[PDB]
From Swiss-Prot, chain A:
GO terms for cellular component: blood microparticle; cytoplasm; cytoplasmic vesicle; cytosol; cytosolic proteasome complex; extracellular exosome; inclusion body; membrane. This is 26S proteasome regulatory subunit 8. Residues 84-254 are annotated as: May mediate interaction with PRPF9. It comes from Homo sapiens (Human). The chain holds residues 103 to 356 of 406 of the full protein. Component of the 19S proteasome regulatory particle complex. The 26S proteasome consists of a 20S core particle (CP) and two 19S regulatory subunits (RP). The regulatory particle is made of a lid composed of 9 subunits, a base containing 6 ATPases including PSMC5 and few additional components. Component of a complex with USP49 and RUVBL1. Interacts with PRPF19. Interacts with TRIM5. Interacts with NDC80. Interacts with PAAF1. Interacts, in vitro, with the thyroid hormone receptor (in a thyroid hormone T3-dependent manner) and with retinoid X receptor (RXR). Interacts with ERCC6. One of its GO terms (biological process) is proteasome-mediated ubiquitin-dependent protein catabolic process. The keyword Electron transport does not apply. The gene is PSMC5.
From Swiss-Prot, chain B:
Keywords: Acetylation, Phosphoprotein, Proteasome, Repeat. The modification Phosphothreonine is found at residue 24. PANTHER family: 26S PROTEASOME NON-ATPASE REGULATORY SUBUNIT (PTHR10943), 26S PROTEASOME NON-ATPASE REGULATORY SUBUNIT 2 (PTHR10943:SF1). It comes from Homo sapiens. GO terms for cellular component: cytosol; extracellular exosome; extracellular region; ficolin-1-rich granule lumen; membrane; nucleoplasm; nucleus; proteasome accessory complex. The keyword Repeat applies. The modification Phosphotyrosine is found at residue 194. This is 26S proteasome non-ATPase regulatory subunit 2. The modification N-acetylmethionine is found at residue 1.
Curated annotation (Swiss-Prot), chain C:
ATP binds at residues 177-184. Induction: Expression is not cell cycle-dependent and occurs throughout the cell cycle. GO terms for biological process: osteoblast differentiation; positive regulation of proteasomal protein catabolic process; proteasome-mediated ubiquitin-dependent protein catabolic process; ubiquitin-dependent protein catabolic process. It is found in: Cytoplasm. This is 26S proteasome regulatory subunit 7. Component of the 26S proteasome, a multiprotein complex involved in the ATP-dependent degradation of ubiquitinated proteins. This complex plays a key role in the maintenance of protein homeostasis by removing misfolded or damaged proteins, which could impair cellular functions, and by removing proteins whose functions are no longer required. Therefore, the proteasome participates in numerous cellular processes, including cell cycle progression, apoptosis, or DNA damage repair. The gene is PSMC2.
Curated annotation (Swiss-Prot), chain D:
It comes from Homo sapiens. The modification N6-acetyllysine is found at residue 213. It comes from the Eukaryota. Residues 41-58 have a biased composition (Basic and acidic residues). This is 26S proteasome regulatory subunit 4.
Amino acid sequence: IDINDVTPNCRVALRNDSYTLHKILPNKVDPLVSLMMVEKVPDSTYEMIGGLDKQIKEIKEVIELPVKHPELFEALGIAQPKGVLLYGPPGTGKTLLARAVAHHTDCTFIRVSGSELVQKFIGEGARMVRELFVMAREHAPSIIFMDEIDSIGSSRLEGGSGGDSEVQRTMLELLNQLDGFEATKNIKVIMATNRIDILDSALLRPGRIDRKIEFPPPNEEARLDILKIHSRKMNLTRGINLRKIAELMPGASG
Amino acid sequence: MEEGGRDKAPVQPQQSPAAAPGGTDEKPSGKERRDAGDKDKEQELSEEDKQLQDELEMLVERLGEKDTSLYRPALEELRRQIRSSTTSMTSVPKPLKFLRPHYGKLKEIYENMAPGENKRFAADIISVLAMTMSGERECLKYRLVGSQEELASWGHEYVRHLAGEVAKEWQELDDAEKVQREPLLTLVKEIVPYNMAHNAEHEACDLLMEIEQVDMLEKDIDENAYAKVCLYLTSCVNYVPEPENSALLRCALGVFRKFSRFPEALRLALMLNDMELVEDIFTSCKDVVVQKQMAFMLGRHGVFLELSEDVEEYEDLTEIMSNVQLNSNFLALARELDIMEPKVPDDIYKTHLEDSARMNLASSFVNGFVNAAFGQDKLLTDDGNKWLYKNKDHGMLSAAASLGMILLWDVDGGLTQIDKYLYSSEDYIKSGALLACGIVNSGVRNECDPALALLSDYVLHNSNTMRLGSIFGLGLAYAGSNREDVLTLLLPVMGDSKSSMEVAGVTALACGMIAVGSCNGDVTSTILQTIMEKSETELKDTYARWLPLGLGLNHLGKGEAIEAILAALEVVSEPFRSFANTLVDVCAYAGSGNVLKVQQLLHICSEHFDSKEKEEDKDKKEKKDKDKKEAPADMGAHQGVAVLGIALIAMGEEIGAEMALRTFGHLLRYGEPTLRRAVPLALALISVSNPRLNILDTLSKFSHDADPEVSYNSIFAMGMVGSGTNNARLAAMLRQLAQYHAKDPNNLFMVRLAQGLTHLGKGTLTLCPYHSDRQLMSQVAVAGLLTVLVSFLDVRNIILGKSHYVLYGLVAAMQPRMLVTFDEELRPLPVSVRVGQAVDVVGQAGKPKTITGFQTHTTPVLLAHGERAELATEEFLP
Amino acid sequence: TYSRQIKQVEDDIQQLLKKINELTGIKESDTGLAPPALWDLAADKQTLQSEQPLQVARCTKIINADSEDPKYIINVKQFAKFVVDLSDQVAPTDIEEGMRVGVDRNKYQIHIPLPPKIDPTVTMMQVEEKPDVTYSDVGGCKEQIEKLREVVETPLLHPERFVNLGIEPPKGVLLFGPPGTGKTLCARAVANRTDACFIRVIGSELVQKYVGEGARMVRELFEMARTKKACLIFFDEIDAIGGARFDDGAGGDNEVQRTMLELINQLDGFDPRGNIKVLMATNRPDTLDPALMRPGRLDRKIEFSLPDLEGRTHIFKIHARSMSVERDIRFELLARLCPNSTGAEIRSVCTEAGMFAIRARRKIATEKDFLEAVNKVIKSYAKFSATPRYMTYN
Amino acid sequence: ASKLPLVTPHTQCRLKLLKLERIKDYLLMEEEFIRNQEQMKPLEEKQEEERSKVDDLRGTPMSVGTLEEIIDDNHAIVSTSVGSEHYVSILSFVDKDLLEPGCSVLLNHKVHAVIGVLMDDTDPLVTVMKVEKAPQETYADIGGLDNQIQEIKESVELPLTHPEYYEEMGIKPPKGVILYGPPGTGKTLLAKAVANQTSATFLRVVGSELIQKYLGDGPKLVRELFRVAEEHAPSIVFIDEIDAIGTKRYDSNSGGEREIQRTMLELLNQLDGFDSRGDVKVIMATNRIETLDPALIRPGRIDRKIEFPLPDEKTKKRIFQIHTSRMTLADDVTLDDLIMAKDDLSGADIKAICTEAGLMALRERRMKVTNEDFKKSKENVLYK
Ligand SMILES: Nc1ncnc2c1ncn2[C@@H]1O[C@H](COP(=O)(O)OP(=O)(O)OP(=O)(O)O)[C@@H](O)[C@H]1O
Ligand SMILES: Nc1ncnc2c1ncn2[C@@H]1O[C@H](COP(=O)(O)OP(=O)(O)OP(=O)(O)O)[C@@H](O)[C@H]1O
Ligand SMILES: Nc1ncnc2c1ncn2[C@@H]1O[C@H](COP(=O)(O)OP(=O)(O)O)[C@@H](O)[C@H]1O
Ligand SMILES: [Mg+2]
Ligand SMILES: [Mg+2]
């Protein structure tokens, strides 16, 4: 057995009396795979989009372009955008429109929620939060996605507001890191929330977030499009007149 | 790239040399005109030392190098003016055109002949035009020409004048580092006959500038530390007039001529003393110089300053004779005792906070150590007197002598204090009282008891070892005087050829510390006595510790080594009986650079397995390797430490396992963490398989250094480990003595033997027996306790700055910092980088520290060294 | 002249020296190998004098005993407990219960006693070093220095006059005042001049994660202190380990009260610590507990206050005696220009004057530099000043 | 190895040649003496036999343990991974100088005797908060200030570059520096420039990470951070947005507002304790200085306070000139029109406007930017 074949963090077989190296076992599952199987994000693609063409264009111009074509940005001599924020009423498409984008451009999709089951897959103690980058920069073209919980999306304030231990302060730390002190490129951050007027002032400075996209509730045409998309998975009958069904709904959500 | 266009020189002037072969004949005007025009253009471009690649000298190497090489010899029609324009044009490019070994090919352009007065045209360069030519000529051409044939043709006749002109011109434009390169060329050319170069440079230095003299003298003294014996003598005789003839200070020449006394000749020292006595220069400078001319650097200077004007000018020699020691004692007990010195510290004995006669004997040494700086005790050592009637009769004598050691440097009432307990009529009490009286009057050099009281004790030597305990004190009290009367008186004691071998050994040690130079009859008598006694005997090394030591001390302080060779030829015997072969050889090598000589001396037997055949020779070689440390220039220390580690500690059974740490004490005495941790590694460990007593001696030499620091408490921790292991009777006394000696009081820690600036130090002679005192077993019971305590007593206690005026008005105005360790710097050469200190007291100035002045003081008395600068008042700075 | 030859010779000599060092073979050190010159003699003797002659000798704890026969009960952390006896060479006198002992691997026999546990996070607090400040640069507070040294050092230095006079010296002392006054510097000086231990501890180190840990740490500290002869403990920022018992409503901040109660209990009742002297410092003493400030624990209450007029002159003189200034600078005027200031401000004034001198080119700081440094440091920075709201200790 | 630092000649003088010759002669004599026993009385291989037998004694199965206590007579108590601890002996070829409690010690498998000391395993937090390479270009990209730069230089750069000016007149460099002012004014950019230019190791941390979700974890973080900073090298510690540790409260914190006080006390202890500090420089930055504890910013901890005011018209024009140096501007656009866009416009708005205008030009596939691009960009950015 040659040493150069013995890469770190590998499975081997050791004899009994002398504990000498004997073989090399097939492999071990990486922590990223375990974490993503625990989270279970329901991946999708572009064909499951209803009435979100302009949003697709806007997010394509910021996420897809400065990876495949950096020379196009270097010609104009401008900085490459790094952060995107998405806001709108809940159940409108934001996570689906960030997973489809991540899937089509072949990027490693990572999401963080501050839980504690996955804490063993990041670090033993993880006193800080930037340690995730150690696991991220080895999958260079990656995307980090964090969604604001209903504590502010639905419950807003607890009586005096104050600060949210989740989401916002983590994003502040991440955006402070990759603002000049980061060497690795092709790492980006996506934010999802609602009612942007409750964001803290430190995150509304012009130089922090490079684009903000809106997700209004669907109108009649978008509702009909979603009904058409989601009516395929059932044995249907010829002639349903889905226009009337779409008109009945007073535009609640998607 | 691009070629041509702007290169006007490489077009017309390059084709002109090509057509020169057709222009050699029927064109005499052009051959000079083109040369002059090219020389003028080159001089215009070369007026600045910034464009090395000249358009004519550097661009001609494509094809004109051969033309220049083929100019003088391939013409056959050179004139008396064309030859100058040929040699001048060929000497510039040929020096750099050739390869690295170009010093042997400089004779084809410049060394062949001197064209006109090229030194006039060489003032526009630093080391390119003519300085480079002179250096190249002196490197190889003049070195082979002038080695034994200095008188030769123009290659050596005008070569010397050109070299002198170049040396003058180096220190003629700015007196920059080129002036320092001038001394290098003066030393390289005629190194053995450096007197001619020194004489040539003295004329330039005297008339050059008033401020260009101190730096040259400092550089000369800096480079005087390494040269051949004849070269060293020439350097010491050439730098003497630098501070006396060219300079008018008239005070650093007599002080700096100490290195010209032992190395060159005694006659030089006598002439310097006579000149200093003749050149009175009123009294201030002469008195300041002569104050430290009694026992600080040299002695026997109180007999040549007794001129016919002994009123105010020549009478000060009397103050040097006897008043100097009393003044030193008064200063030690006046400015230090009234500031920080208590009546009785006694702090070492109380350290055992956190029963045999050995403890009683070590108590005397502890009391003496803590009773330093005129620590007179009036019945304060009653414990020693009480123990004197119980056991340890020799220990009782040591305790009695500790009373005198308490009252060090006392000649006023020390005799009465010793006589208070002297009246005992014991075979050891009389010896102890005599030793105490001798230690008390150390350095006085007065006629108190030359043949009145000391002779009274010597005339009753019909008894035991009391006879031997009556010559070490008398010899110590007359160590600083080389009078032949005392030496003659002490010679009959050694030559008595009686059963008192100890008396003969002490007489040899006492006389070695008195006279070490001329009067070879004493050395011959000692050798004859050794041959008569030790030949028909095979006893212990009492003879080896007295015959080799006496022979080395009697012939100590002579770098010629001819006397040592004569003694070796007259003492031809077996290597075991020739233990003085390396001892006398190293006694005559007090201070010098002898790395090659040391290697040759160790080449007789490097290892040889030490098969019990030349054990004395091996011990002498080990002691010799401890030498070459008086002025090691902080260079040989590391190599010596590495050699000791890789040769003695790495391999050894008896010689390398016992005396390997002995050389550590002689290496230095200040105390550094590296040595203190290397020795502790080999001393703290038990290593019971080896000679544990040798390990104890190793610890005693690890703590042999004085001036203890706050880390010495760690040794106290080992004291706890010494309760069960390292038995008390064999290690407790040694450990206690080592702990106490380092922290005696606060001052009087100077055991490095360095006086003023760089003095080799005769005090090492007093330390010479001490290094030979601890080389065997049985600790110290009869002989060691009588010599290990009072081996050296010539240390200057504390003070470094005082007025020492007639009224002694000024007290202290200084600012301390680290010592000066710079060689080449700007005009105000920096001293150190520890300016973070400033005090207004005259207390301890620190070992490796120097104090500067301000407020327009400038120390107008000495300004060089002395530790007792008068610092005359000046008010020229508003 | 022959610069190239000399340089080549020197380079060859250095290369030969490195090659010779490589030749001697003092190499490896990947696994922790000592240089061959060190263990050259220790190569074979230990093979037959340290491998088989020495045993593993596990460590256990005796729990109790019984009379007329040893029959000792031995407990271990992971295996079971046994009944055992001694060995031949050990006396039954020094086999007292509740202490660690050595035990065989096969027959389980006591061999040697052992020292108890130490909790290394408590062992790291020993200073083992001495700072480099003395009493000579603590000017302005001579009376406080005298009053502190009368109790901290003198009884430990000459313990014969107090015993002769039948007087028991005080034990504790507290130092309070505004921030910057000098307390920690005086503690540094005391630790420098001392000769016994110096166990330093900061209150913020006693805030642990699990319940019932601070009291354990205090117990270990006092046990380790009592083990040695007699030596000192220093508490820094004591106002973070206990203010006052105020338990109202939901129980908040009371485990720290248990830590403070253990610390209080260790200084009084049922054979107090005895020969241990503690000294504490704080900047807002108005919030400490009443039961901690009574005599018997904090007998002395030295106070550090802002210097009046001559303390400022002394601080100026001792902080600028290593300067490069002319002969005509008067410090009385500079002292009069800062009516209420601390030593830190004066040191900063000196440093800024030096920096202004260094600013352009000059080598000697002038009086105008001192005046403008005072103007820019005292008058301009008085926005922050930290002082006005701590003179009321709030 | 500092064998002989006396190379003061440093020229073609005879002094350098003489010193080199003396050192070479001493080294040659030492080498000859060392090889005399290596070639005259070897009596054994002494080169490969020693390693062979020390490997023979040291078995091939080799376990690990942690030191707990050591006794002077060359043995110590070591605890095993399982939990049992022994009273094994210490061998004599284990260079017993780096044996420290808590260090991983390599033990034998038969009798568990100490046979080696093992190196460390880096640390998964050092690489987290250590800067590897320089961020961007130096002070030439800043513009506008020209006065705070000299102060930060005097505080940081000069002692490293020229530790001689302070030694001439014996003063110490200023201890601490703090930067305050309105947001978006160039504090972090100057910190980036300092990190780029300097040569010492750079450590950074955001002040919002000093509060943890357990009791007694903030002080531990501060202690460990300063231990790392003091143990690497001459270094620089950058703590920005420190005031955020006090102006925000999170329900994830187990303790209330007292743990913040304990963290503050630990921070003051680390900044101005009584143990030797070494050589560490601290830089702080905030935009709300009125909420910090005054006792934290007393002279002797933070020595310099530097304010960053809002830019003026000249600085606005300079920032336009800086940020459009590599942009193909059409002749229609003029910077003076955009100078008076807002009364209190800041530096970040310039970069925001320029970048978003470039993006808007990129949308329509136009390389040259026009006036309408800027006109819509300023309205889209500022007015919302
Ligand atoms: N009497 C004094 N003489 C000289 N300097 C002093 C004096 N008193 C205080 N100082 C200055 O105070 C500085 C810091 O003092 P120190 O940290 O000991 O104060 P403190 O009262 O313990 O502070 P804090 O409450 O902030 O912990 C020192 O660097 C020193 O320059
Ligand atoms: N004076 C300036 N010169 C050049 N660019 C500037 C200047 N001021 C601000 N900027 C721009 O603003 C951007 C953001 O500045 P930076 O984040 O460093 O601000 P700050 O002072 O740290 O503010 P905050 O405290 O609000 O984070 C910089 O990257 C730079 O492009
Ligand atoms: N425009 C849309 N077309 C089709 N389905 C949609 C659309 N928007 C949301 N959905 C449905 O919403 C569900 C996921 O909700 P999501 O939008 O991810 O939550 P959030 O709004 O918090 O991001 C999916 O099952 C998807 O079918
Ligand atoms: Mg303090
Ligand atoms: Mg910032």
